[model samples]
Target: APDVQDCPECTLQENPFFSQPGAPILQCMGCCFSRAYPTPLRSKKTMLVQKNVTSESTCCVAKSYNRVTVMGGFKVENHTACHCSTCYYHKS
Candidate 1:
């Protein structure tokens, strides 16, 4: 049996890892960040399992290029990267 885990970036994102019961480790694929059991026992022979954000909705603080749009009679405006939770979660 494998335990389920949520994405570090966002609490809304979650998935399951099919590893041995109590032997699974949750790791990140984006940034140098990861988290899991801080167990003391070490293993020398085991495969690594990792998960990554597959889409925008699964990301909380992801990279965003400036977006430009026209509003109010040909007026241009830009949306910069806010890098905040609302910026990613509100869309969902």
Candidate 2:
């Protein structure tokens, strides 16, 4: 699992990563800064599986590097990214 880090920019924006249409931006409870979002977890952006899932269900934080995007999902094809559990999950 990847370690969670502080992001001043993400915290300030109140979202760890940029906000998408259907998903609420994630925010770090640890600080104030816009987070890069989708960090690496277990060497992959595994958190993507838990993206919109409740925090209680998440297994671990994703590492920063493994978070860009994997394969399927909205906007990713358009070269953008969507994290809304509904958007991505229901999308495919």
Candidate 3:
């Protein structure tokens, strides 16, 4: 099954206020369950890349990110969904 939920702090890439002291950084992430498999492409150009698999032809990624803000412009990431998306070319 696919896992779509709030991402852990480890994967949170929102450091918009990392150096801004007492900035009250608010962030979150939505990550989808994904893994790799052996599936070489028919073309040699693509075959050279590592073999892997993911949800359908799309890659598993964060599909949504909503921010909750009202007073003081205090924001909070509102992750609600995750799904497969296009895969990026990798050379290795």
Candidate 4:
């Protein structure tokens, strides 16, 4: 399950206040961690690249934020939904 797969909604930021020693409340289930692999991938980090010079193919991007007044006082921009799209990486 550590590899790329189809597009699905996943947690973008869970427990925004996990840095502290309080409640472990979830922040947003409004993002994705999906990426379909076309070639055999070699994982180094989340900022991944294939074995050779290739683009970061199909991936997910957070494209929206809910302006909810729930976490009113400490409310910052949170992930609303995942935007599935493709991006090209220029080899340098």
Clashes of each: 0, 20, 3, 0
Which residue pairs does candidate 4 place in steric collision?
none
lDDT of 4 by residue, 16-58 (tens): 5632344343344433344344436466456744342245434
* Per-residue accuracy of model 2 over 1-92 as CA lDDT, tens digit each: 84974533211122324445543344223222123474443565434333334332221121121122322632222222222112233324
lDDT per residue (tens digit) for residues 1-92 in model 1 = 64974434422111123222332222222322333443254673588554434343233342342222223422111222323322343545
lDDT of each: 0.31, 0.30, 0.42, 0.44
lDDT: worst 10-residue window of model 4:
18-27
Q: Which candidate do you rate higher for lDDT, 2 or 4?
A: 4
Clash count, candidate 1: 0
Local distance difference test, candidate 3: 0.42
Estimate, for each residue in 1-92, the C-alpha lDDT of model 3 and write its tens digit: 75874444223345355323433333444343333632353654643344345444434343454544535876444323334444465311
Candidate 4 to truth, TM: 0.31
Give TM per candidate: 0.19, 0.17, 0.23, 0.31
Best by lDDT: 4
Rank candidates by lDDT, best first. Answer: 4, 3, 1, 2
Per-residue lDDT value at 61 in model 3? 41
TM for candidate 2 is 0.17
Model 2 is weakest, by summed lDDT over 10 consecutive residues, at 57-66
